[PDB]
Amino acid sequence: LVHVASVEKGRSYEDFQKVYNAIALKLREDDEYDNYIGYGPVLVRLAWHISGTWDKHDNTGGSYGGTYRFKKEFNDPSNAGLQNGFKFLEPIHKEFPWISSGDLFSLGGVTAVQEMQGPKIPWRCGRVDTPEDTTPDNGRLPDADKDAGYVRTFFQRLNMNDREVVALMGAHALGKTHLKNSGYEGPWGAANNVFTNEFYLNLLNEDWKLEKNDANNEQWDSKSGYMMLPTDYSLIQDPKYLSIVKEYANDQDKFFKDFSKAFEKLLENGITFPKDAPSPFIFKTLEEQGL
Numbered sequence: 001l002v003h004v005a006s007v008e009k010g011r012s013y014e015d016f017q018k019v020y021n022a023i024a025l026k027l028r029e030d031d032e033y034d035n036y037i038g039y040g041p042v043l044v045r046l047a048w049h050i051s052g053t054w055d056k057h058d059n060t061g062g063s064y065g066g067t068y069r070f071k072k073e074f075n076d077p078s079n080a081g082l083q084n085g086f087k088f089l090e091p092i093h094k095e096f097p098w099i100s101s102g103d104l105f106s107l108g109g110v111t112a113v114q115e116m117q118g119p120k121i122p123w124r125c126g127r128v129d130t131p132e133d134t135t136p137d138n139g140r141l142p143d144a145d146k147d148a149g150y151v152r153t154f155f156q157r158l159n160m161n162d163r164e165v166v167a168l169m170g171a172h173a174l175g176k177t178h179l180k181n182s183g184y185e186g187p188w189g190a191a192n193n194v195f196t197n198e199f200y201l202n203l204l205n206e207d208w209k210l211e212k213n214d215a216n217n218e219q220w221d222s223k224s225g226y227m228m229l230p231t232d233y234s235l236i237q238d239p240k241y242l243s244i245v246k247e248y249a250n251d252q253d254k255f256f257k258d259f260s261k262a263f264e265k266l267l268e269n270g271i272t273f274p275k276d277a278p279s280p281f282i283f284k285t286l287e288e289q290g291l
């Protein structure tokens with residue numbers, strides 16, 4: 001497979017900045033979702049799950065085709081709870097019917113990180129909707145009940161190295177786990193709709209206790225009322241991952257710079273960009289525009 005990026009016919013930077021502004025205004029407005037966390041966290045989880053199906057060996061999956069819109073991927077057990085993010089974006093797609101599904105789903109993730117005071121993420125347009133038979137089969141997204149060796153091996157399929165894996169996992173400062181979606185329950189931290197290096201500081205400074213939860217799954221719980229998945233706690237059990245966790249815990253700016261690069265790479269895997277194509281767009285926040 002080759003997937004060539006094709007700009008939506010006749011659209012420029014200003015068009016995409018209007019879709020970003022529509023998503024960001026609705027993030028502001030629907031602030032009550034999930035006990036006042038807001039939709040920002042489920043939207044960056046949606047952008048990672050539609051990208052995370054990519055396989056570097058045959059170029060299948062990834063964000064390009066927008067195939068989450070199809071039943072098979074939509075109903076994947078690993079995507080439980082993402083229907084909420086889909087439903088959020090659906091009025092925005094009726095307002096801007098020209099944008100492709102993969103461009104809308106990935107842009108939702110970018111808009112959410114930046115509106116939650118995160119780093120600017122360069123974003124490229126050009127994903128093209130592909131047919132229902134290009135939809136990847138279920139089972140390509142990662143399990144949470146595993147160790148550092150599984151994590152390393154998993155992310156190799158998306159050719160992410162150690163630094164990129166640790167930077168990307170820092171998005172778990174956002175939102176929370178929900179028992180009915182995944183068999184896990186609880187937040188990773190206190191400031192869960194502000195993008196900060198809090199995940200790393202919690203992993204290094206809390207007194208974590210291994211416990212079983214109500215779904216019979218294990219998770220690491222702290223006195224503070226926070227939790228960590230087996231795969232998160234893996235990052236301090238592996239010596240290579242632990243030196244990077246310490247780095248980001250001591251330097252949020254380095255975490256932001258590395259997260260920015262790794263998240264753009266994740267959203268663009270599998271896509272070939274012609275050099276006639278526009279450079280990556282840097283969108284302004286509502287705040288920068290006075291809106």
Ligand code: HEM
Nearest residue numbers: 041042045048081142143144168171175176177178181182
């Ligand atoms: C080995 C890797 C990963 C595993 C096993 C994993 C697993 C999970 C699980 C089990 C949840 C809870 C779902 C729920 O009950 O609602 C979750 C939530 C979330 N994940 Fe991850 N994750 C991984 C990587 C990532 C990455 C790479 C990102 C983003 C760059 C990410 C972003 C999120 C976000 C923001 C949420 C919160 C969503 C919400 O609050 O509804 N995760 N993750």
